[PDB]
Symmetry: C3
Subunit: 87 residues, 3 copies
């Protein structure tokens, strides 16, 4: 089966759900008005996520794994980028 990870923030809330499906991770988003496909698109068979706020600014970290390789993907409001995480 597909494998998911979820995070949320605030009271509306905002929710992000990441799904690993046949080696591809995609993202679905809720901000109070319906679900849509987010910007996140990266390879992986496994996903986890965490997020935190600084004021009202969200910071998301997605950990994508294929075999024994885990890559951290980062969002701070302006595009996804690879983080410094190493195993």
């Amino acid at each position: 089966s597909v494998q998911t990870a979820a995070t949320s923030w605030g009271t509306v809330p905002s929710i992000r759900v990441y799904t690993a499906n046949n080696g591809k991770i995609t993202e679905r988003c809720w901000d109070g008005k319906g679900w849509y496909t987010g910007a996140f698109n990266e390879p992986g068979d496994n996903v986890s996520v965490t997020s935190w706020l600084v004021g009202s600014a969200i910071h998301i970290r997605v950990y994508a794994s294929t075999g024994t390789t885990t890559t951290e993907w980062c969002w701070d409001g302006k595009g996804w980028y690879k983080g410094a995480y190493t195993s």
Copy 2:
């Protein structure tokens, strides 16, 4: 192995642990005074969860997957119900 997902809220805290075992997801609850089996029961092989507070009110969302179908289940204080979540899979 069985697959779990966990969430917590507050500082006591309250904890909810969802376990997918042989296609069924069940819930175990902690509110500071021992574990007990909760009201959540849905089919699935994979599970994730998130939760948030609005003042003192807890809201939980559980994402249950079987094959490529993921269903969202919602708790807003008065029973579990199916949410609007969908995914293009």
Copy 3:
């Protein structure tokens, strides 16, 4: 593939990432100034985690599963220990 779980707290933030690989769960840590290996080391094939702050103090619960048995491991600042969690 390996399976991970992640938690974070505060605004720095602190992050903990747990990886289940070859039946062992290990932990990598971030507190704002580089990644390092954490104290957590327990058996498991599946992992989930949650954490909460009590003032400035972190409390972590890791749920490690092997077969149909899930064990809860607890951190309250002074070593990891098995918690009271049980399933069915």
